[PDB]
Amino acid sequence: DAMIVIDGHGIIQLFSTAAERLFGWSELEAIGQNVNILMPEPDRSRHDSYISRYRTTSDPHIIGIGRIVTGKRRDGTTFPMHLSIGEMQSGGEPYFTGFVRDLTEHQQTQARLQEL
Ligand code: HEM
């Protein structure tokens, strides 16, 4: 599914091909951008504080957990997505992998079934 890797400051390091299809950005456009560009406010401005919180305290909240959130595409449309975060280390620095699954079709079917 969509895979994204960031360093300890939330900057995107690797951006899969599927992530390019899901979010709109090419990998070259994405690499070097903060991860907060893939999500709407209030989370967007808050995100770096979430990572900071985790880094200074070492007490996890969603690391190793899989949850549903709203992502935000290049065109600005929002969508529900299942997010799973992995923490890794390399060259002495922490990295984080996010595996995303688009749930837009699940939300649509569900709404349609409720609508009818
Ligand atoms: C694009 C949709 C995303 C949203 C809405 C989002 C939102 C959030 C929120 C709300 C928190 C704090 C959760 C809590 O304190 O309970 C958080 C933490 C964090 N997010 Fe994201 N995130 C997004 C994607 C990502 C991705 C793609 C990555 C990794 C590649 C990532 C990495 C992190 C990290 C490292 C933390 C700290 C975890 C912790 O506090 O245990 N986020 N995110």
UniProtKB/Swiss-Prot annotation:
List of residues binding heme: H47
Residues of the full protein shown: 154 to 269 of 505
Species assigned in the record: Bradyrhizobium diazoefficiens (strain JCM 10833 / BCRC 13528 / IAM 13628 / NBRC 14792 / USDA 110)
Record-annotated PAC domain positions: 56-115
Role: Putative oxygen sensor; modulates the activity of FixJ, a transcriptional activator of nitrogen fixation fixK gene. FixL probably acts as a kinase that phosphorylates FixJ.
Top-level taxon: Bacteria
Gene, per the UniProt record: fixL
PAS domain ranges (all copies): 1-55
Record protein name field: Sensor protein FixL
